[PDB]
A paper describes a structure:
Flaviviruses, including Zika virus (ZIKV) and Dengue virus (DENV), rely on their non-structural protein 5 (NS5) for both replication of viral genome and suppression of host IFN signaling. NS5 protein is comprised of two domains: an N-terminal methyltransferase (MTase) domain responsible for RNA capping to protect the viral genome and a C-terminal RNA-dependent RNA polymerase (RdRP) domain for replicating the viral genome. For instance, DENV NS5 interacts with human STAT2 (hSTAT2) to promote protein degradation of hSTAT2 mediated by ubiquitin ligase UBR4. The MTase and RdRP domains of DENV2 NS5 form an extended conformation to interact with the coiled-coil and N-terminal domains of hSTAT2, thereby promoting hSTAT2 degradation in cells.
Residue numbers in the entry:
A (entry chain A): 1 to 127, 140 to 408, 423 to 483, 497 to 506
B (entry chain B): 8 to 883
């Protein structure tokens, strides 16, 4: 129902964390508890992150009102000759915040949230990766919003400087006027301000790139683990392998990368106008663009996976098995739910791209269509879903080597096109039903202890007789 | 040479391998705390840059021993100068730097001995005349992959530095590329002439091959260079040793005295005041030995609590309307100044602590004669008299233009509260009885500092203000003594033919037009840098001569006020110290400190006298100022009688601002007498002739330029004008009497009508004045001191509609307007052209309008509702 006193009674280790935060924090500790009821009653979240430089001002004025009044009532009682001064001491440090009210709301709102982390952590101990991912993406969105605001402000300041320089140029006044000295001095000041804004924007962009690379390198092992779990679950074992969290994460990452690249394009286009000497932007823009492109390519290269391997529809008991002259069902998904709204996306298929060097293997040709087209609205309605439920294979000891089916896609978005390839789990082709009785055991021989998935060359009781 | 091979090897490398080579045995300093210490605003116990440890390593090992006066070339942020300031034998540190984009600028700090260090920015060393010095430091130089350009830069640096050294000067100069022959041969002769050698600083990074040239050492160049090159090429063979972190130095805090004093006090006058002040705070009375005062006497100090901050209230209501003005740097950089004890000390050191020189005999005689004649001339129709208590009560009751005073917050809380009590009058009577016997006991001043921005000093029409507060009783006593000067309008244009006191702002343009109708040369409008601190004792003695027209108790009181207070002053000022905050008490004889109105009158008188003397000199009446002889004294007196009155009608002096139209252009070349009295001009060479104007619409006066306007029917008006940025930026500042919505709303509405009355003729200010008056809920009296304190009009504070006031001011009460046909709408009033508006600072005409035009219609009609639950009423 409240805070402060709850933290005090809890225990020392959380008090030390409380001690550190509130100490260096400008807001004095004493003022926190006297005004505790009022502070927690205010909607600081709306003031810090919203559109209306009026609510922040209102909260500013009310804060001053409360600070002034409470001092007077306590000043009437003597022997409180230390808190009264502290009330006036805080009244001086609030004064610089009058320039920008929103600085108050952000500082208070952040302070309220942090002690909530301590409280929940303390009770949980007394009585992970996904939450870290969500926190990371939330911070990313917030600081990207901050970067957007900074870019807009820089654009406006550069525009007004260009207008002032233009009106000075059309003036054509070569005089020894002290007004001219004043205006040249203020021109130098404007140039210094512009340089400072540019360097700050560059630093923020670099921080964003670092954080986003960290998120991607944390994300990829989850995809690898899901692939391993899918391999272990396709072998007649019930284990869920849902893709919703991974697809959402991939979509968020793709959106963030595209937004970052698009902003840098506009930044360079703006900088072109009044580009001049000692401009780090001329190199920073291209280096950041190259890094962003590299990260996008790296993410998209592993972003292609196959949800469902080619399976027998009539007999689902045996997966990863092929028979001549029959239809097969395959499902491939893109973890990134992004696509241009005017261009359909095209996916091709192939079988046995790389043949072995041994005696001529049983190469097979896809009689049916190897190409499928997805309508753009399908990505919105259900996602990037590819289904081939009628694929067939024909033939141009039986289980000594396996065959690999490959998927190839050209992904295009915002003018960037990348070639993408992926492979499915190795499979064996049988020309008759009877040989499957030993083909199952031979497939197990490959599956149980294969460290390389692309190598075409007691405990079992959970599989042999689990059915 | 081996250095070339080392450089080629380093150049042939990759970035990843490069980034690891840097730290392989160097010594680092742990700056993990200094960065965030400086970021939050701390100004002590910290090192600004990394060079402090670099120079410390040399000093502790007594390679170079600074002493006397130290000159730093290219100080950058200023680590070396700040470190040197805290040493023992150092007496003064001077630093020059070349600021601007891509370059470091100095920053202010308050470490030990911070008052002995002075730094400058935007000065190029390569074309600076040499000056006397005892120690020389140079740390300039930039690296480049090409060795030839590095050699050229090193040669240029050496040639620049060579001119400064003498036989007995300590030096420490950085040399960048010493391993190739064309620098070696040059350094041979230098080492032969001046001695010293080269040594390497261990703390330097491994990427560079720089060295340093020191004063107290010996050896051979080539052997040392070869040894260093061999070590460099052998270094990249072992493992990666973790750099040995070293703790950053701390500099403490406080001030440091130099040991010279040049002022002697008069104890028989101020002994009682000093004794009383000491007895009041006897508990913590102590003598400090580190007072930084040179030209002021020092007596003692005690303890107090710090008052002040950085930046003030910004008017909330005024904002949210001038949204497009946030990007403009002039508006924001001028917002508010610093009044903390550190800023007060900085201002006091910069401006108040100065010294002036006495004039010669001829100047003294001329000033005496002119002052006598002028005093006899002004009092031809008037007669001095004493003021009463009832007038003072009436003035204080109606919130008149009282001086800057403190109301003795202990016993009472406000002036109006304190007037009605009888004990206040008992204290006043006691002080009056003491004064009547030529003694004073409770007449001390309080100082407060202001004026401290970068771009704010160029647009606040002031800077270095340093205003003086006074007790209420002393203010009443001074009023009783010398209120007749202002209550009788002694300096009006009717009585004295030069003053403009009592004229509103909207009427000075006509006066300037009338001055231009005479025959002569051009108009000259020079100004003085820091007029208030250039007043000598002679000016005070000359102004004291008004008592010759008084008699009796009035004469005795006036003489006592002039003698015991105006030229024997005691002042309290704050000072930061390691133990907290202390208050010092100091004394001084000359310089001007008094009430505002008395100061205005006396400044006007002195300015008139000085201008008359300069006009005398230009005409060639007298020749030599060293000594004045007979047949010139009579000539001077005859000139004053014959044409004295008509010469005073060629000028217009408000305060310390003057505009003069002489008889001939010889006026611009006569600068001996003006420089002799100490009235040095501002931003000009000492003997450079002045500059005139051939048009009356360009001459500045009271920080204004006066355009002229033509109505639709044909009548012509003259209107004031300024730079719009200054007006908008000042309109955002609240004086600090708020802590409420009603106060700030009333203030905004109060000086949102100045714009509708005076500055109505420009597009961008007449639209922003209707919105603000449509946003406040009306029905509230707009009572608050706005601006232009000296202009005694304050007439836009009425309640009725502005059209009637405009008709009453600009038509019927305008002597220079012939026909009196009135107007009946706000559309007949014209605008300030189209391009002249952009010239003076508007935001219309091109893409800036593409940004602003969001303000109009789209934003105004929605922000007025954004005001919130606070009601209003439409006006547009
Ligand atoms: Zn007195
Ligand atoms: Zn103008």
């Amino acid at each position: 129902m409240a805070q402060w006193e709850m933290l005090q009674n809890l225990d020392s280790p959380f008090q030390d964390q409380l001690h550190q935060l509130y100490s260096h924090s400008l807001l004095p500790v004493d003022i926190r508890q006297y005004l505790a009821v009022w502070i927690e009653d205010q909607n600081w979240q709306e003031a810090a992150l919203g559109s209306d430089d009026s609510k922040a001002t209102m909260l500013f004025f009310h804060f001053l009102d409360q600070l002034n009044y409470e001092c007077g009532r306590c000043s009437q009682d003597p022997e409180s000759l230390l808190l009264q001064h502290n009330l006036r001491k805080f009244c001086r440090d609030i004064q610089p915040f009058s320039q920008d009210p929103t600085q108050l709301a952000e500082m208070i709102f952040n302070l309220l949230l942090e002690e909530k982390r301590i409280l929940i952590q303390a009770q949980r101990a007394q009585l992970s990766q996904q939450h870290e991912i969500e926190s990371r993406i939330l911070d990313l969105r917030a600081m990207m919003e901050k970067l957007v605001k900074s870019i807009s402000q820089l654009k406006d300041q550069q525009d007004v400087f260009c207008f002032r320089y233009k009106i000075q140029a059309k003036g054509k006044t070569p005089s020894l006027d002290p007004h001219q000295t004043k205006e040249q001095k203020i021109l130098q000041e404007t140039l210094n301000e512009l340089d400072k804004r540019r360097k700050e924007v560059l630093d923020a962009s670099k921080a964003l790139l670092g954080r986003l690379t960290t998120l991607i390198e944390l994300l990829l092992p989850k995809l690898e683990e899901w692939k391993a779990q899918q391999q272990k679950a396709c072998i007649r074992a019930p284990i869920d392998h849902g893709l919703e969290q991974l697809e959402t994460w991939f979509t968020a990452g793709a959106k963030l990368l595209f937004h970052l690249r698009q902003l840098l394009k506009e930044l360079k286009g703006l900088s072109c106008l009044v580009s001049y000497q000692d401009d780090p932007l001329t190199k920073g823009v291209d280096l950041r663009n190259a890094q962003v492109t590299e990260l996008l390519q790296r993410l998209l290269h592993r972003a292609f996976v196959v949800e469902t391997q080619p399976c027998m529809p009539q007999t689902p008991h045996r997966p990863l098995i092929l028979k001549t002259g029959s239809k097969f069902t395959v499902r491939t998904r893109l973890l990134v739910r992004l696509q241009e709204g005017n261009e359909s996306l095209t996916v091709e298929v192939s079988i046995d791209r790389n043949p072995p060097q041994l005696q001529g293997f049983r190469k097979f040709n896809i009689l049916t269509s190897n190409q499928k087209t997805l309508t753009p609205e399908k990505g919105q309605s259900q996602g990037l879903i590819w289904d081939f439920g009628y694929l067939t294979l024909v033939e141009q000891g039986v289980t000594e080597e396996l065959h690999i089916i490959s998927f190839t896609v050209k992904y295009t978005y915002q003018g960037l096109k990348q070639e993408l390839k992926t492979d499915t789990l190795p499979v064996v082709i049988i020309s008759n039903m009877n040989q499957l009785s030993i083909a199952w055991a031979s497939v197990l021989w490959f599956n149980l202890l294969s460290p390389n998935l692309q190598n075409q060359q007691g405990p079992a009781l959970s599989w042999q007789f689990s059915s | 040479t081996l250095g070339e091979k080392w450089k080629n090897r380093l150049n042939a490398l990759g970035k990843s391998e490069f980034q690891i080579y840097k730290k392989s045995g160097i010594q680092e300093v742990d700056r993990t705390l200094a960065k965030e210490g400086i970021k939050r605003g701390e100004t002590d116990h910290h090192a600004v840059s990394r060079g402090s440890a670099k120079l410390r390593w040399f000093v502790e090992r007594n390679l170079v021993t600074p002493e006397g006066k130290v000159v730093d070339l290219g100080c950058g942020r200023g680590g070396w100068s700040y470190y040197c300031g805290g040493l023992k034998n150092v007496k003064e540190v001077k630093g020059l730097t070349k600021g601007g984009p891509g370059h470091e600028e100095p920053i202010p700090m308050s470490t030990y001995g911070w008052n002995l260090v002075r730094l400058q920015s935007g000065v190029d060393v390569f074309f600076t005349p040499p000056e006397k010095c005892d120690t020389l430091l140079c740390d300039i130089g930039e690296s480049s992959p090409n060795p030839t350009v590095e050699a050229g830069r090193t040669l240029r640096v050496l040639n620049l530095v060579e001119n400064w050294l003498n036989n007995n000067t300590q030096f420490c100069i950085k040399v960048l590329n010493p391993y190739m022959p064309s620098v070696i041969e040059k350094m041979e002769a230098l080492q032969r002439k001046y001695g010293g050698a080269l040594v390497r600083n261990p703390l330097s990074r491994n990427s560079t091959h720089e060295m340093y040239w020191v004063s107290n050492a010996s050896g051979n160049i080539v052997s040392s260079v070869n040894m260093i090159s061999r070590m460099l090429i052998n270094r990249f063979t072992m493992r990666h040793k973790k750099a040995t972190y070293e703790p950053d130095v701390d500099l403490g805090s406080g001030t440091r005295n130099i040991g010279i004093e040049s002022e002697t006090p008069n104890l028989d006058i101020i002994g009682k005041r000093i004794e009383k002040i000491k007895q009041e705070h006897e508990t913590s009375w102590h003598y400090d030995q580190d007072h930084p005062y040179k030209t002021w006497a020092y007596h003692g100090s005690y303890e107090t609590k710090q008052t002040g901050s950085a930046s003030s209230m910004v008017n909330g209501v005024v904002r949210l309307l001038t949204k497009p003005w946030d990007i403009i740097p002039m508006v924001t950089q001028m917002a508010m100044t610093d009044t903390t004890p550190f800023g007060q000390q900085r201002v006091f050191k910069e401006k108040v602590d100065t010294r002036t020189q006495e004039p010669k005999e001829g100047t003294k005689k001329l000033m005496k004669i002119t002052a006598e004649w002028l005093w006899k001339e002004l009092g031809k129709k008037k007669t001095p008299r004493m003021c009463t208590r009832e007038e003072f009560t009436r003035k204080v009751r109606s919130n008149a233009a009282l001086g800057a005073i403190f109301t003795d917050e202990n016993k009472w809380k406000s002036a109006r509260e304190a007037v009605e009590d009888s004990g206040f009058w008992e204290l006043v009577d006691k002080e009056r009885n003491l004064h009547l016997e030529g003694k004073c006991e409770t007449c001390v001043y309080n100082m407060m500092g202001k004026r401290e921005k970068k771009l704010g000093e160029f647009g606040k029409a002031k800077g270095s203000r340093a205003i003086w507060y006074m007790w209420l009783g002393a203010r009443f006593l001074e009023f009783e003594a010398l209120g007749f000067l202002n209550e009788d309008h002694w300096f009006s244009r009717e009585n004295s033919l030069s003053g403009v006191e009592g004229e509103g702002l909207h009427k000075l343009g006509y006066i300037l037009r009338d001055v231009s109708k005479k025959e002569g040369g051009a108009m000259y409008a020079d100004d003085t840098a820091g007029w208030d601190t250039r007043i000598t004792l002679e000016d005070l003695k000359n102004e004291e001569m008004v008592t010759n027209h008084m008699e009796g108790e009035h004469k005795k009181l006036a003489e006592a006020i002039f003698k015991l207070t105006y030229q024997n002053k005691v002042v309290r000022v704050q000072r930061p110290t390691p133990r907290g905050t202390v208050m010092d008490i100091i004394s001084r004889r000359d310089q001007r400190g008094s009430g505002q109105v008395v100061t205005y009158g006396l400044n006007t008188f002195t300015n008139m006298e000085a201008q008359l003397i300069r006009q005398m000199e230009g005409e060639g009446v007298f020749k030599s100022i060293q000594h004045l002889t007979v047949t010139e004294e009579i000539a001077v007196k005859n000139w004053l009688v014959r044409v004295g009155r008509e010469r005073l009608s060629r000028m217009a002096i408000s305060g310390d601002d003057c505009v003069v139209k002489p008889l001939d252009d010889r006026f611009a070349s006569a600068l001996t007498a003006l420089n002799d009295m100490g009235k040095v001009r501002k931003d000009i060479q000492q003997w450079e002739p002045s500059r005139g104007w051939n048009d009356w619409t360009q001459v500045p006066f009271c920080s204004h330029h006066f355009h002229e306007l033509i109505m639709k029917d044909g009548r012509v008006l003259v209107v004031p004008c300024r730079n719009q940025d200054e007006l908008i930026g000042r309109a955002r500042i609240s004086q600090g009497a708020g802590w409420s919505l009603r106060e700030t709303a009333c203030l905004g509405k109060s000086y949102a009508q100045m714009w509708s009355l005076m500055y109505f003729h420009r597009r961008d200010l007449r639209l922003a004045a209707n919105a603000i008056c449509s946003a406040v809920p009306s029905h509230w009296v707009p009572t608050s001191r706005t601006t232009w304190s000296i202009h005694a009009t304050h007439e836009w504070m009425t309640t009725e509609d502005m059209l009637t006031v405009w008709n009453r001011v600009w038509i019927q009460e305008n002597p220079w307007m012939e026909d009196k046909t009135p107007v009946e709408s706000w559309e007949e009033i014209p605008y300030l052209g189209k391009r002249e508006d952009q010239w003076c600072g508007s935001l219309i005409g091109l893409t800036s309008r593409a940004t602003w035009a969001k303000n109009i219609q789209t934003a105004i009609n929605q922000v007025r509702s954004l005001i919130g639950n606070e009601e209003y009423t439409d006006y547009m």
